[PDB]
């Protein structure tokens, strides 16, 4: 299986709506896709526990009909750090879980797309961050960059951790988080110079069907 | 001279209270202190040429009188990267003048505070950054947190890089964003525990004589 995460340089930068537009494309490409959260917070009461809006995303836009504990392991109700949320609860995160999750995915998928919670150093426990997970896993790396004011510092911060870890940043994709804006070309032109890895696609503000932005063909 | 720069997780951090800040507790210690913002876009015009607040913030909290030109150099109208607005204008931001503006405050000055613009990475001309000044000065510097959720990665990331250039983070500061929420303490032990850097004080959100919150004996 082909094999990615993506993360983004800030909380809010529309990464599951690059995620569900990776996942359109793949499908379009011939894929059997699945979209996998291992963890999640900020999450609705059903009458069969807690869902996450995103992780729904994911489910829905995956190829195969997954089941929704499949896509998401681990739910948590407040959104907040996972690490903040799983000691109040008293369940903790654990990367045997995590992994276990990814294999049991590529039994099924040939193109898996694994969505991480929060920005690259997001915190799972007191000793573990995400990245600690993504390293010892080998993922390749998607960086979604919402484009404003702020985004050259984050997305050149979060491109060179991921190298010095070793890990291949395989492209970035721009989400356009407002309207059309004075700089826009010249803050496209300085994140393409700057981002060591291919633009994949930019996807246009819109306050569903996006897969057409996405240039799989640069993956 | 002493001699600190700061730089912010993002750029809505309120980076300049918190240099206000330390300019307070340092002229409270007894130093002849100068605040030095070379670079500084987004200004108004007025009878003697345009004039940023941030800047006239700084000049406004030295001990010594100071000339603004002597705080800040290179001054843009607009609020954009100081490399767009410079390349447009035709007006090269130069290493040199920059360095040479720190030398002549030092003349007057013993405790000399450089704030930068943005985060870490803004890019000053399209071969240089604010970082590869800050790494040629070899100063030490001070991270300005605003404590809202997704900081503790963009305070992991910056303190990483700064790191890797081989620069000495000398301390951080906790600025409130926001009113009194849910998680603001445990927010603070991560932050303190995953920063490098001695907590130098935290400053409490307001909606001006603010150097009691600074810890000096920490620097
Ligand atoms: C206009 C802002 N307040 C600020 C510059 C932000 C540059 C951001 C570059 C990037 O995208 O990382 C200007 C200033 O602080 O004087
Ligand atoms: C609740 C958020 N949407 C998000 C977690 C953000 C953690 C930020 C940690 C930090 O401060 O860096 C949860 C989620 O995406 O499922």
């Known amino acids: 299986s082909k094999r990615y995460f993506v993360t983004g340089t800030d909380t809010e930068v529309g990464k599951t709506v690059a995620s569900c537009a990776l996942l359109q494309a793949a499908k379009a490409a011939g894929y ?5 959260k291992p963890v999640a917070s900020g999450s609705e009461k059903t009458p069969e526990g807690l869902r996450n809006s995103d992780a729904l995303a994911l489910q829905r836009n995956s190829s195969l009909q997954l089941d929704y ?3 998401n392991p681990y739910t948590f109700a407040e959104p907040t750090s996972p690490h903040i949320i799983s000691a109040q609860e008293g369940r903790p995160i654990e990367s045997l879980v995590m992994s276990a999750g ?6 099924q998928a040939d193109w ?3 969505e991480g919670a929060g920005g690259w150093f997001t915190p799972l426990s007191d000793t ?3 990245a600690d997970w993504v ?4 993922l390749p790396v998607i960086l979604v960059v919402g484009v404003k004011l702020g985004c050259i510092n984050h997305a050149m911060l979060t491109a060179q951790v991921i190298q010095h870890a070793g890990l291949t940043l395989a492209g970035w994709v721009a989400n356009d988080v407002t309207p059309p804006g004075k700089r826009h070309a010249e803050y496209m032109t300085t994140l393409t110079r700057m981002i060591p890895a291919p633009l994949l696609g930019e996807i246009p503000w819109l306050a569903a069907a996006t897969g057409k ?3 799989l063909a640069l993956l």
């Open 102 to 107: 990814l294999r049991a995915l590529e039994q």
């Open 213 to 215: 932005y996405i240039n």
């Open 32 to 36: 059997r896709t699945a979209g996998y």
């Open 128 to 130: 573990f961050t995400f």
């Open 69 to 71: 504990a499949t896509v």
């Open 135 to 138: 390293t010892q896993e080998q």
């Open 112 to 114: 898996v797309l694994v």
